[PDB]
Design a protein around this ligand. Structure first.
Ligand SMILES: [Cl-]
Ligand SMILES: [Cl-]
Ligand SMILES: [Cl-]
Ligand SMILES: [Mn+2]
Ligand SMILES: [Mn+2]
Ligand SMILES: [Mn+2]
Ligand SMILES: [Mn+2]
Ligand SMILES: [Mn+2]
Ligand SMILES: [Mn+2]
Ligand SMILES: [Mn+2]
Ligand SMILES: [Mn+2]
Ligand SMILES: [Mn+2]
Ligand SMILES: [Mn+2]
Ligand SMILES: [Mn+2]
Ligand SMILES: [Mn+2]
Ligand SMILES: [Mn+2]
Ligand SMILES: [Mn+2]
Lengths: 79, 99, 105, 94, 97, 106, 86, 99
DNA sequence: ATCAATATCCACCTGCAGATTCTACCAAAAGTGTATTTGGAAACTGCTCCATCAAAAGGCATGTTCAGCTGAATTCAGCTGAACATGCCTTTTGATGGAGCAGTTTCCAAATACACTTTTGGTAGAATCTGCAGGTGGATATTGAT
DNA sequence: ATCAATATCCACCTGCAGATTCTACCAAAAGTGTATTTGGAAACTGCTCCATCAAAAGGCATGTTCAGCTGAATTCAGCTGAACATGCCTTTTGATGGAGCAGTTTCCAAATACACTTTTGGTAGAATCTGCAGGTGGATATTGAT
């Protein structure tokens, strides 16, 4: 399916930026889990903002507001 | 002569490379599908601003990189250099994320 | 004939910031000095970051501030960092930092 | 219509601290999000502060206390300075 | 000397307390806590609602605003039931006048 | 005639007062008719949800009056209430009994 | 007439009380280095809360820190406290 | 003939005791002095509502017990049953308190 | 540490495309000059609530002894995770067009805000009630030694 | 597989401190009747947005080989828990002076409410520039071997 599209090398790359040197093979599937939970929660909140605005298209502000209200403020798309 | 760098060297090399860089590290389309799949579980017929899909990837990669940081610290804490799922889990609990 | 921003010696728009205060459901009446004072604070912080970022830019031999410069500017400063501890700068990246035990030799 | 920014002011400020440097557009927006953000924290805390004291008015005093509560100490001090300064100057002009 | 009434949510919490446990009473520190819980959640909703009105350039907070608010703030199930109750409370309040 | 809005909505919580608190709270300029009703309802629902759970705790713990400990047991044992109040500290609440397995003897 | 001079009071956080707290945390064995470490953390924690609470006090033109000042203080610090006013 | 609970037995006993419990664990007055000291170093001539001093204690003991939980998890993570300052520091670094 | 040989990096230059800066204009904000409002700062002052102070009592904090069991130091083999070259295919990306919609306008009926004028519901102490906090003494586990 | 030593539970009791009920004003709901707004409900734009298309290109999936790391097993000094003797200072209970909230009145400096009158900041084409992305050719780093 689509999570699996979050490839092991890309997972390995993110880890690298994190300063990670050695990666257990079990990490990748664990990581895919976290990422899907992360995304779900953000998107759920985003679409709610969408639905509130009587729209059918998620805007970048919908994502921002969502992130902002979840404790993860994002600069660069706001306004 | 066939030639091999010792284990953990290209890793260090990779680290210095990616910490120096700023680019998104998950590929844009696989991610975009992932976004759109998940989203239609909440409402149907949804369109996405390009900026909106992008904002998300920035946030996700920010989140995950941060998480691998705190994870690698738990790996170190256990006298290891290999991140394991215990480590990701300990981080997520202390972050309060789902304890 | 003469604007409140220049009247306070500011670049930031004391004018707009007063309208935004009124129109933001903060309190029923907004004070005369509050938009000046606030505009003053916002400019200071802007300047504070921006110089630090410009310094970051020249050090990578560049003349234009990109996000990385802003991210470098912020996370290398103990106080701006505390202020934006919860903020993500898109296209910012992270500070080069590698735990010691991971170095070889 | 017109979607307004803090861009031209951010730029003006960019030049008087650094006349050398220009600013990437995606970077310019980052800064714009920074200004609107901090704007909101201060204004929100300021609102609250007036409530705690059953006041109907947000004054420079409320903005100040706010700034002492949001900003870290060195940053807080300097901002209070600059803020007091702009106010006293704008008082004294007319 | 003539204390300016400090009003509470106490009597209502008590009423509802009785509707579920006609059995049980409540300690005053416990009552106070509950009283702090109601005011808290009031503010969270009312705030989020405030923002929602701002994003849609609306000057008015409607039961519709509170609802989106409640969906964002509450967890599932608490959200689902809480929506129902509000929706029910509202149309019943309509239907009377 | 006297009819109150609270009763007009079938609620215990005071729709009137909650309409005023909205108007007076710098949330928006105009407040809609249903907003205080819908909110009084939601505040009322949650009060009950917590209170029933707490009452069980008081009874499970032999007692007739709910104290803070009880509200804490009620909240920290309900996965959803617990998430709602993740950042909340209940004075005199204590903590849920929990001892890591690796710590017990055998 | 004059006030008494307060000092070294973080030692009032006795080792028994630090242990008691760890127990409620579900701690079985405690290194001797913990107690002085804890005192550090507690003081930072406490300072920051008192700094803000007192800031609310002076803003309200008062000389007495009210329980509401601590509550607001705790709140804007991420730690909402039920039991003392809202 | 003299009788001794084995090491670690009274600890488990003590845990079960204090977790079952709800009372403040720091002495009332020693803590109040601490409060009046710290406060006074920030401003002089301060008075405190008895409730305000209590509110602070309630928060502080809440905080420290919370902190000791996460600490104890890093200890276990490191294959220990003894909390160390290193563990408190990992907890706080990840809590983001001061990383 | 030298001795040598793949690969990795780093510098200095270089041509151009993608953006960035610079220029030329107009509704909508901002600044003004009045006419009022109005909040809240000052000036008493009735009164909770804090700060001391004292005096007596045991609940605990301190400090010492002492040995059990934990943490740390060491060793080592099995095997997991890194590096590497191959072979393949999914992602990129570049228009190209059609259409779904955000984003704006133009009214109006519905809903809300006012301004007063009554009508209760809540609240603040007094007046009663009643959990349960503490204190005992025997049954039931739990724990640790022969 | 047992008993001796403590700690844990559970019931049953009894007066008070804290909860509940009872009464009585007042701030605040509620009921009416004008006097505004506003949030949509339709008609239509221009625009970003999905859907393909069609190659090309790196980026990914596999499999092989093995370095080196994680986990296991053992060992031991010495740290930290359990227990005890001592007496300190915290906790309790009561009283008192007065500092400082809190509550009302009184009244201007300050803010709002208009009504116009400027001015600025936004938008769409216009006009240089800064890096990116490659290109050598020069030391560096990493690794295999006397
Ligand atoms: Cl002002
Ligand atoms: Cl009544
Ligand atoms: Cl001009
Ligand atoms: Mn029931
Ligand atoms: Mn004994
Ligand atoms: Mn060179
Ligand atoms: Mn024109
Ligand atoms: Mn002693
Ligand atoms: Mn061990
Ligand atoms: Mn009545
Ligand atoms: Mn008892
Ligand atoms: Mn040792
Ligand atoms: Mn202009
Ligand atoms: Mn280059
Ligand atoms: Mn280059
Ligand atoms: Mn080359
Ligand atoms: Mn070899």
């Amino acid at each position: 399916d689509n999570i699996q599209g979050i490839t092991k090398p890309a997972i390995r790359r993110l880890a690298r930026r994190g300063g990670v040197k050695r990666i257990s093979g079990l990490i990748y599937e664990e990581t895919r889990g976290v990422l899907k939970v992360f995304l779900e929660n953000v998107i759920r909140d985003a679409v709610t903002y969408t639905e509130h605005a009587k729209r059918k298209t998620v805007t970048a502000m919908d994502v921002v507001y969502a992130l902002k209200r979840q404790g993860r403020t994002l600069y660069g798309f706001g306004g | 002569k066939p030639h091999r760098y010792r284990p953990g060297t290209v890793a260090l090399r990779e680290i210095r490379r990616y910490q120096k860089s700023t680019e998104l590290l998950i590929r844009k389309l696989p991610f975009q599908r992932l976004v759109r799949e998940i989203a239609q579980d909440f409402k149907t017929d949804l369109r996405f601003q390009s900026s909106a899909v992008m904002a998300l990837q920035e946030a996700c990669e920010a989140y995950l990189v941060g998480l691998f940081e705190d994870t690698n610290l738990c790996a170190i804490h256990a006298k290891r250099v290999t991140i394991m799922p215990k480590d990701i889990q300990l981080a997520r609990r202390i972050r309060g994320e789902r304890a | 004939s003469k604007s409140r921003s220049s009247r306070a010696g500011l670049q930031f728009p004391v004018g707009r910031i007063h309208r935004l205060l009124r129109k933001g459901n903060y309190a029923e009446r907004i004070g005369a000095g509050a938009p000046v004072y606030l505009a003053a604070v916002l400019e200071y912080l802007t300047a504070e970051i921006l110089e630090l970022a410009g310094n970051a830019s020249r050090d990578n031999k560049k003349t234009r501030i990109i996000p990385r410069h802003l991210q470098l500017a912020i996370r290398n400063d103990e106080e701006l960092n505390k202020l934006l501890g919860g903020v993500t700068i898109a296209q910012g990246g992270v500070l080069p930092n590698i735990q010691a035990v991971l170095l070889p030799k | 219509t017109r979607k307004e920014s803090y861009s031209i002011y951010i730029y003006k400020v960019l030049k008087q601290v650094h006349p050398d440097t220009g600013i990437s557009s995606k970077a310019m927006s980052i800064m714009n999000s920074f200004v609107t953000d901090i704007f909101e924290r201060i204004a929100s805390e300021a609102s609250r502060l007036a409530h705690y004291s059953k006041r109907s008015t947000i004054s420079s005093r409320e903005i100040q206390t706010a700034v002492r509560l949001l900003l870290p100490g060195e940053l807080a001090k300097h901002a209070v300075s600059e803020g007091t300064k702009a106010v006293t100057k704008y008082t004294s002009s007319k």
